[PDB]
């Protein structure tokens, strides 16, 4: 009777149907049984990575015993769940724990096999000492107490295989992880258990996506655990949407309810600097209050348009009663008039009346796997499509020219959002090289802005420091048992948290030609492993490789120089190698505008503008010279001409805030 204090009853719990269904895994259950019912040393231990299903098999065996599908050698037997935790609770006196464990052991032995002790997490049995988990070695080798355990695959070799005197008494049962085709079946069986918990309904076209999708994105965790969670969270989110107002009607309202308070408290400031701040927040407040009511009206357009059709469905039901009564009265004329007329016509009408949010679908799964792990996998929800359609106009605001590159960098993004690219390869990995000062670094910074709205959220590594072959370990971590090892890589451990950034290998031709060979398998597979032995997936980034090879050759004095610097096995991995071209005098008059815009923006910190005249605005370009240093010298000329005397004046009085000074071309130089 000591077991009533230190153990619960798995089989009794399964009798009232308080466990979950168990599907598949016939070989494993049959092996567990046929090992559990032998003469001596009859005690299995399940094993395998955490998440694959190892307690579900014991629970399935319990349900199977309650059913009666096991042979006579096992029919009518109770499985007890031992608990080493609740036995060492109060045992401060020198024999309490030994006494308790002895009582439990003798009470199990006293039965005739009516009891099967099932320890979960049995790797905890090595402790309890202070001669503990050692008084069970006698009874184990004789098969008296049946033991059933479950420990993850890599604490076994850490807590048990140390004690081979013990792991001899145990029979191993390897539990391999399932595949998608059987995870589909497991989900199809489990659906109803969550359908009742969350008062919603779940589509099978969604149970398929919750497994096909969660196998190529969330690669850190194992099968089953990583496909049930999407379903559960999606159902919970849909229930939240059902109860209160839906999302995207909630975020806008919340943020407006804050902008209001902000502008209210900003209205009572006694300054002129805040006067332009109150005059900008007051515009976004209106811009957002517009969309709130627009989306609010769009909500009723669907809430009541479908709602009017509810009477017609009931009307369709009324038509079915009408056909019933037509056939009651012998009204053949109405029988078909309802069967082929009214009822089917109202049915086509009602099919047309269907607006679209009352059951999870193959898109809420994508929404959850996008909120988690950050990788965008959706359907281009009507706002992203318009923006993606004009990108070479959105990148053109920072880069000027280079349509050769902007028509290819922005190409591997569209055909990746449209669900067409290869599923296991980087979204794009191409190296573009050309003369200096053209913008080959500015493009990979203008692009990263277009996605995350932050030019610094990308992983940038400078490949001019890797001048020695031994400096590779900086980005791949150091092998175990060395100085810096519990720090991992630096390239690797930076992508394992946000697998969406755009990595940028800057100035690649300077690195010693073995960093190339390390890079060789990053392309074409998107995988590498740091010291700890963790594979990291690069199948979503955009690998970009700057360079300065050739340096002046037209096309065959550089394309014959990169061939003699890289190997074919490496050049073959990349996508098309882009060639940048120099700057014509025409396409510099716009860089002038961009530079002056940036300068004025930086001078907005003092409420200080400045006017510019087209003569000087084109004289700057006319002194944009020497198509051998690109568009860099213009950046020095601007601050030699304008900013120099502007700063010499700004600290000598005669210029203050709110002012404005126009530049005008003196016969040779610029005079304010």
Ligand X SMILES: Nc1ncnc2c1ncn2[C@@H]1O[C@H](COP(=O)(O)OP(=O)(O)OP(O)(O)=S)[C@@H](O)[C@H]1O
Binding residue ranges for ATP: 48-55, 434-441
Which residues in the chain precede a discontinuity of more than 2.5 Å between C and N?
130, 356
* Closer by beta carbon to another protein, 501 or else 546: 501
Binds 186, which of a copy of itself, ligand X, another protein, none (CB < 5 to 8 A, cut-off by type)? ligand X
Q: Is 471 in the site for a copy of itself (CB under 8 A)?
A: yes
Q: Are 516 and 474 in contact (CB under 8 A)?
A: no
- Residues with Cβ < 8 Å from 197, sequence gap 6 or more? 235
* Closer by beta carbon to a copy of itself, 3 or else 515: 515
Question: Considering the complex, what minimum distance in angstroms separates the CB of residue 8 from another protein?
Answer: 11
Indicate which single residue of 17, 68, 71, 127 sits in contact with another protein (rule: CB under 8 A): 127
Tell me the window of 113-121, 481-489, 496-504, 653-661 that interacts with a copy of itself (CB under 8 A): 481-489
In our burial notation (b when 16+ CB lie closer than 10 A, e otherwise), range 474-500 reads: bbbbbeeeeeeeeebbebbbbbeebbb
Strand 428-433 and strand 670-671: the pairing is unpaired
- Per DSSP, the three-state class of 382 is coil
Q: Cβ of 238: how many Cβ atoms within 10 Å?
A: 22
Q: Is 486 in the site for a copy of itself (CB under 8 A)?
A: yes
Q: For residue 104, which of 121, 89, 84, 122 has the smallest C-alpha distance? A: 84
CA dihedral 648, 650, 653, 655 (to 10 degrees): 130
Question: Considering the complex, what minimum distance in angstroms separates the CB of residue 184 from ligand X?
Answer: 12
Q: Is 410 in the site for ligand X (CB under 6 A)?
A: no
Q: Which two tokens stand for residue 121?
A: 């997490």
- Residues with Cβ < 8 Å from 484, sequence gap 6 or more? 477, 478
Q: For residue 41, which of 133, 143, 109, 119 has the smallest C-alpha distance? A: 143
Indicate which single residue of 548, 574, 618, 627 sits in contact with ligand X (rule: CB under 6 A): 548
Binds 54, which of ligand X, a copy of itself, another protein, none (CB < 5 to 8 A, cut-off by type)? ligand X
Q: Is 159 in the site for another protein (CB under 8 A)?
A: yes
Rounded-to-integer distance, Cα 214 and Cα 234, Å: 13
Rounded-to-integer distance, Cα 575 and Cα 106, Å: 72
Indicate which single residue of 66, 128, 508, 616 sits in contact with another protein (rule: CB under 8 A): 128
Q: Is 459 in the site for ligand X (CB under 6 A)?
A: no
Binds 11, which of another protein, ligand X, a copy of itself, none (CB < 5 to 8 A, cut-off by type)? none
Length of the chain: 672
Q: Is 143 in the site for another protein (CB under 8 A)?
A: no
Q: Which two tokens stand for residue 458?
A: 């990308």
Q: Are 206 and 361 in contact (CB under 8 A)?
A: yes
Question: Considering the complex, what minimum distance in angstroms separates the CB of residue 395 from another protein?
Answer: 21
Q: Binding mask 115-154 vs a copy of itself (x if CB under 8 A, - otherwise)?
A: ----------------------------------------
Q: Is 425 in the site for a copy of itself (CB under 8 A)?
A: no
Q: Is 315 in the site for another protein (CB under 8 A)?
A: no
Residues of this chain that bind ligand X (CB under 6 A): 20, 22-25, 50-56, 150, 152, 186, 190, 224-225, 228, 399-401, 436-442, 546, 548, 569, 572, 591, 630-632, 635
Residues of this chain that bind another protein (CB under 8 A): 49-51, 84-85, 88, 120-121, 123-124, 126-130, 152, 154-155, 159, 221, 225, 229, 258, 261-262, 265-266, 269, 271, 273-274, 277, 372, 374, 454, 486, 488, 493, 497-498
């Amino acid at each position: 009777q000591a077991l009533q204090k230190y153990s619960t009853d798995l089989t009794a719990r399964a009798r009232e149907g308080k466990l979950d269904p168990v599907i598949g895994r016939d070989n494993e259950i049959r092996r567990v049984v046929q090992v559990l019912s032998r003469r001596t040393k009859n005690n299995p231990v399940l094993i395998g990575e955490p998440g694959v299903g190892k307690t579900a098999i014991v629970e399935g065996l319990a349900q199977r015993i309650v059913a009666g599908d096991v042979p006579e050698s096992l029919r009518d037997k109770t499985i007890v769940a031992l608990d080493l935790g609740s036995m060492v609770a109060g045992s401060k006196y020198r024999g309490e724990f030994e006494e308790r464990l002895k009582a439990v052991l003798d009470d199990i032995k006293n039965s005739a096999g009516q009891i099967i002790t099932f320890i979960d997490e049995l790797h905890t049995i090595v402790g309890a000492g202070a001669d503990a988990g050692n008084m069970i070695k006698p009874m184990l080798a004789r098969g008296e107490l049946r033991l059933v355990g479950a420990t993850t695959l890599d604490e076994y070799r850490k807590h048990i295989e140390k004690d081979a005197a013990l792991e001899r008494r145990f029979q191993q049962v390897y539990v391999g992880e399932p595949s998608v085709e059987d995870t589909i079946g497991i989900l199809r069986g489990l659906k109803d258990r969550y359908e009742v918990h969350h008062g919603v309904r779940i589509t099978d076209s969604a149970l398929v996506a919750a497994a096909t999708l969660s196998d190529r994105y969330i690669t850190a965790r194992f099968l089953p655990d990583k496909a049930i969670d999407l379903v559960d969270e999606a159902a919970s989110r849909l229930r939240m949407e059902i109860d209160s107002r839906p999302v995207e009607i909630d975020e806008v309202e919340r943020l407006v309810r804050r902008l209001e308070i902000e502008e209210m408290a900003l209205s009572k400031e006694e300054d002129e600097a805040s006067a332009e701040r109150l005059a900008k927040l007051r515009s976004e407040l209106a811009d957002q209050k517009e969309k709130l009511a627009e989306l609010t009206t769009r909500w009723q357009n669907e809430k009541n348009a479908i709602e009017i059709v509810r009477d017609l469905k009931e009307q369709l039901e009324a038509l079915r009663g009408e056909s019933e009564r037509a056939e009651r009265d012998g009204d053949l004329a109405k029988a078909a008039e309802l069967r082929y007329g009214r009822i089917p016509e109202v049915e086509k009408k009602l099919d047309a009346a269907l607006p679209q949010k009352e059951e999870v679908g193959p898109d809420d799964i994508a929404d959850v796997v996008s909120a988690w792990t950050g990788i965008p996998a959706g359907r281009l929800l009507e706002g992203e499509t318009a923006k993606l359609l004009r990108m070479e106009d959105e990148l053109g605001k920072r880069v000027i020219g280079q349509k050769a590159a902007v028509t290819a960098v922005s190409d591997a993004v569209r055909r990746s959002r449209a669900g067409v690219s290869d599923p296991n390869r980087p979204t794009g990995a191409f190296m573009f090289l050309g003369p200096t000062g053209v913008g080959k670094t500015e493009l990979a910074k203008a692009l990263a802005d277009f996605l995350f709205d932050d030019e610094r959220a990308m992983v940038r590594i400078d490949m001019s420091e890797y001048g020695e072959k031994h400096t590779v370990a900086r980005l791949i971590g150091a092998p175990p048992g060395y100085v810096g090892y519990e720090a991992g890589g630096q390239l690797t451990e930076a992508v394992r948290r946000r697998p969406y950034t755009v990595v940028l290998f800057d100035e690649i031709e300077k690195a010693h030609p073995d960093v190339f060979d390390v890079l060789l398998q990053v392309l074409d597979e998107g995988r590498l492993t740091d010291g700890h032995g963790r594979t990291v997936d690069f199948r979503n980034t955009i690998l970009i490789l700057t360079s300065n090879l050739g340096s002046g050759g037209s096309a065959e004095q550089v394309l014959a120089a990169v061939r003699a610097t890289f190997k074919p096995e490496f050049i073959n991995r990349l996508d098309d190698v882009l060639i940048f071209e120099g700057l014509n005098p025409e396409e510099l008059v716009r860089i002038v505008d961009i530079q002056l815009a940036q300068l004025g923006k930086r001078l907005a910190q003092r409420r200080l503008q400045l006017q510019v005249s087209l003569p000087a605005k084109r004289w700057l370009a006319q002194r944009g010279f020497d198509p051998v240093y690109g568009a860099r010298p213009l950046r020095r000329l601007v601050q030699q001409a304008i900013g120099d005397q502007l700063a010499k004046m700004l600290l000598a009085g005669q210029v203050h805030d709110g002012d404005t000074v126009p530049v005008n071309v003196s016969p040779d130089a610029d005079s304010l």
